[PDB]
Every structure is written in structure tokens, then in C-alpha cells.
Amino acid sequence: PIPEQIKLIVDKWNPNHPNCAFKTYLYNKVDEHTVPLYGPGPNEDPKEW
Amino acid sequence: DEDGLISLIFNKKESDIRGQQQQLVESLHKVLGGHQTLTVNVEGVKTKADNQTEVIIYVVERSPNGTSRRVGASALFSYFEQAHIKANMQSLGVTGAMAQTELSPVQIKQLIQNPL
Amino acid sequence: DEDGLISLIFNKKESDIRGQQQQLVESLHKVLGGHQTLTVNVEGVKTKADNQTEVIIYVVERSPNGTSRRVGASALFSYFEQAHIKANMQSLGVTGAMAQTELSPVQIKQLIQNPL
Secondary structure (H helix, E strand, O other): OHHHHHHHHHHHOOOOOOOOOOOOOOOOOOOOOOOOOOOOOOOOOOOOO | OOOOOEEEEEOOOHHHHHHOHHHHHHHHHHHOOOOOOEEEEEEEEEEEEOOEEEEEEEEEEEOOOOOEEEOOHHHHHHHHHOHHHHHHHHHOOEEEEEEOOOOOHHHHHHHHHOOO | OOOOOEEEEEOOOHHHHHHOHHHHHHHHHHHOOOOOOEEEEEEEEEEEEOOEEEEEEEEEEEOOOOOEEEOOHHHHHHHHHOHHHHHHHHHOOEEEEEEOOOOOHHHHHHHHHOOO
16 A cells, blocks of 8 residues: 555645645636636536536 | 727836837837738836836738728737747737736636637 | 527428438527537427427537536527527428516516517
8 A cells, every 4th residue: 555645645746636635716706797707627626616 | 809909018117118119119010920911009108117117009900902990909919928929029028918808708718628 | 497498399290300300400500600609409309280390499508618508598589589580490490489488577578568
């Protein structure tokens, strides 16, 4: 179980988002009717969104 | 969007911008390709800080039939943000740019889905 | 209303509708403008008489941010009842249309005050 923890730690400290462990969301204000836009991108879990 | 206004921030003092405005406008014309069908116009110049100046421009494009109109702001911004063009702009002292058009949600969604 | 369902009556036999469903769906997509941000879906097909078939559809619209949702039934019905669009629909064999949303009294009052 050694080369798993290592890979998981290498995964934690990373912007690739494999359970980044630095996952916090900040709410940016946007007036309507632009709400329909945004619209995440590459590695966004709809769950988190 | 039809008003075609792009705001540019320059890392230059206002007096320097105004003092060489002819040259600045022609350099922007060159960045656009320098053809006689495009004309850069200055809408306004405003000091923002000791060595920061905002210059608002638009570009008039002429058609083969002699008709003229402003380049849409989104279209002009899209050109200026292209990596090669942005670099040329930075060489003129531009450190930022903004369009006034408030994009629709669908436009924003498209930009996020295809950031390049 | 969010389910976006529009019932269409066609003056065609059910076998003919099903036999050319790909073509029918694309023609409806064309009536809507044909953009790739709109997709016509068939919810159901039911025979009503020898040469009458009901086809229930909805339309999925995609935003610039990649999000999708159904076009509201009232909005879709409003488009299809416009005189130019209705005529195009009639050319496909459509002889009637219905939305399922039960309008509010205030909505009904508005439609009567402004029938156009």
C-alpha cells in the first residue's frame, strides 16, 4: 500500500483535480441574463458545481 | 457591441500618450494589418495613475462598395487577445484591455467550453 | 411548461411518419433555424385516424457554457404559431398544434388583450 499513498499525495498537491484536496468554490456575482452562461470547463464534477 | 469600443490600459503617462498620439494610433493601425480599409479612432484618453493611461478606441472598416461601419467590440477584442497580437500590443505598452459588451449566458458558456 | 412538450397533428398515416422520422425531425429542426444549439426530440407518435397522426416533440437548447435545457412549451408554441412558421409547418403536413401548459388567468388575459 506504499506506492498508492505516494501517488495519492502527488495527486493531492496538483491542479489536475484528482481529489485536489484544495477544493474550495468562490461565488462570483454575475447579473442576468448571463446566468445561463458559465458553464465550467475541463475537470469540473457537476456534483461539486 | 455595434459601438465597437475597446478600452486599453497603457503603462505610460497621459502626457506621453497625448504627445505622441499620431504615432500611437498608426502603430495600432499596423497591428491590425495596416490596410486602408481600417481606421483607428480615439474615443477618449484618461489618466488612471501616475504612469497609467486608459485609451478608448474603435475601428472603422470600409466595404468594397464604399460603405463604412464600426468593427464590433467583441470581434475587435477577439483579435487583440490572440497571443501574437497581444504580444505586439504589450510591446506598445498595453497592459490590459476591455470590451463594454455584456455577453449573453450562451456566449459565456461557449467561451468556457472553447477557451481557445 | 419546463417539460417543453408540443403535440402536433399531421395529416399523414402513422406508418409514413415513422418510415421517414429522420427526415421529419430534421425538417422541424430546419423550421427552427437549423442551428446546432437546437435539437428536436420525439417524445411519442400515436395514430389518431386513418390519415391522422399525433407527434409529440420537445426541443433541447444548449447554452454557450455547454449547459442544456428544454425550450419551455409556451415559448416553443409561440414560435410555431407565428404566421410564417405556421405556414412552413403546414407544408410539412401539420394541421394543428397544442401545448400542455395550463395558462394562468393573467396570462390568458394578456393574450386576449394582445392577440397578436
